[PDB]
Structure 1
């Protein structure tokens, strides 16, 4: 609604037994005061559990005490717009009529594309779970030279699946059982992952733990299965979707010497650096859009057009030979559960 600023906030309530629940209400079984309120954190040690179990005698007074905690989130909105202008002679004397229709169509298409790019970059920036291929620990440490290149592998995908399963993230899809046609195989993949067009050959060259081919194309399981739009294959538990306009960081990697084995590089400040690619996974109920006077939609576009004539006459132009057209909108995003977003940063072959 209006008159409330540009921010939306919400509470999240932590369970009793997590590590995030920190407080000073604890009282151990002996009756003494203790530092931590929760009985035990996300610890599976049998010794710790045995030490911190709540036990009672016949008369239990001030023996075991607990506490609770809550967390808050937030998000904001922004404003965008652009315009163009023309004259009356350019319209009257031009070779073909209908130029205005072409200009308006291109304007609207550009607006939609910019909106999509703006949303995607925010989603990439707000990722919670991040893995770095190889031995890298940050963007600057990602490199394609040395003993261990920063290239995605089977074990990285397995670890990402393990983390997502630990976070109790819901599964998007179901497994596929085989068909009766020859050269058709089964694929038990239950999640959806988006990749750019540059990473597909590297995925095709991947091998599993036993040296077999790991990337199964869509023609193998097209029968007895449903193919998503843009799907190219499936690896392990993920189904690969190819996005035409997937973005990347150029020059964010380490410096590139002459020992480059064939990975893409870009020039930054006269020096050559490697590229980094997203490999994004989006879980269910991860985020939501903020709509400001959008009538229950994500975006609403406002267009104002003024043609040449008396309405454009002014002191600076007494004759009124100019006009214009403009477009603007509002956008904002709120992320509820950041842990459901996953990301794997890696280099791509040239």
Structure 2
């Protein structure tokens, strides 16, 4: 038999969350912590101070005129009014808040032998090993960032009628699947929190059979939820999902986009992470939703669906040359350099990689998330 002298290799896995993150420069000789101030407006409820005098000259508990309350009676009760011979009547107070983040360390290494280096039939083995090492490092770092983002969400909307992760179940009267009304509510919440948009509406083209789409935000889903999204129907019973070929004209298709529903442009991320066993126990009445085995009991699987806003978070950069993350690689080939003091044979070697990673969440209200089950 005759070896082909060529190898079969699988490329990297493309990364979606890492490119979004912005980088904040942190000089050394300071520590492992970064902090910022945040000045709250005058009228928000967060303005808890002790500098209040009402219109009658008497001290009052709250220093903000009226909170984030739209009630007309409350506003009329707490309006600032001034008489003609006015003096020392209305006082206001201010407040600032601080936030922080920290840097953590990572790393891994591998070993090999000189006889394996030489006598091996394949030539260029160590190049392959370096390639897989680097790919593994990149994939791990992306997974860590995605995990931290999912853990640090600020706006959470459970689907169906659930309240916590243990309650999200796909069996019974009301299964916990994503619905059109849930997406409408998520849009409403983001609009109320003043989150800026990302894209713009797509008007029509002149070519036959081309629908008009007005989504304005970007949403990341897993691979498992795509059939569920495709099967969704809107309020009037028609189809909801609009595929990309309809509006590819008169618009720009983003990377890894599957379609548009309501006001979100769905994006499929291959390396999306899901919880395992978070849901309630699954009996034999399963309609066909994915489950998992935890402690011998079949529990449902709770799935993500995430809408990262703008300026929500930044990535601390420690000696990264203004990048999100930079790796450090070392190699020592066998020889006298690796001739151990108790073993001058020197038949082995190694290669190691390490980095520093940390994240600062400036505003956690902009991050949004939906938890659902995913069909099998």
Normalization by structure 1: what TM-score? 0.98
Give the 3-state SS of the residue equivalent to 2:183 in structure 1: helix
Answer yes or no: is 1:136 the counterpart of 2:162: yes
Matches within 5 A, 1:201-350: 201-350=227-376
Whole-angstrom distance in 2 between the partners of 1:31 and 1:147: 59
Matches within 5 A, 1:1-350: 1-350=27-376
Instruction: Give the aligned CA root-mean-square deviation in angstroms.
Output: 0.9
Give the 3-state SS of the residue equivalent to 1:8 in structure 2: strand
Whole-angstrom distance in 1 between the partners of 2:341 and 2:249: 71
Structure 1 gaps, min length 5? none
1:318 positional shift? 2.1
1:341 positional shift? 0.4
1:182 positional shift? 2.1
- Residues 274-308 of structure 1 deviation map (CA, whole Å, 9 limit, x = unaligned): 11111000111111111111122211111111111
Give the 3-state SS of the residue equivalent to 1:339 in structure 2: coil
Whole-angstrom distance in 1 between the partners of 2:138 and 2:196: 30
Whole-angstrom distance in 2 between the partners of 1:119 and 1:186: 35
1:157 positional shift? 0.6
- Residues 73-120 of structure 1 deviation map (CA, whole Å, 9 limit, x = unaligned): 111111111111111111110001111111111111111111111111
1:315 positional shift? 2.8
Give the 3-state SS of the residue equivalent to 2:280 in structure 1: strand
Whole-angstrom distance in 2 between the partners of 1:147 and 1:69: 48
Contact 2:259 2:266 in 1 (8 A): yes
1:149 positional shift? 1.0
1:2 positional shift? 2.1
Give the 3-state SS of the residue equivalent to 1:338 in structure 2: coil
Normalization by structure 2: what TM-score? 0.92
1:4 positional shift? 2.1
Whole-angstrom distance in 1 between the partners of 2:170 and 2:189: 26
- Residues 209-234 of structure 1 deviation map (CA, whole Å, 9 limit, x = unaligned): 11111111111111111110100000
Whole-angstrom distance in 1 between the partners of 2:38 and 2:287: 48
1:323 positional shift? 0.8
Whole-angstrom distance in 1 between the partners of 2:356 and 2:77: 55
Whole-angstrom distance in 1 between the partners of 2:53 and 2:286: 60
1:69 positional shift? 1.1
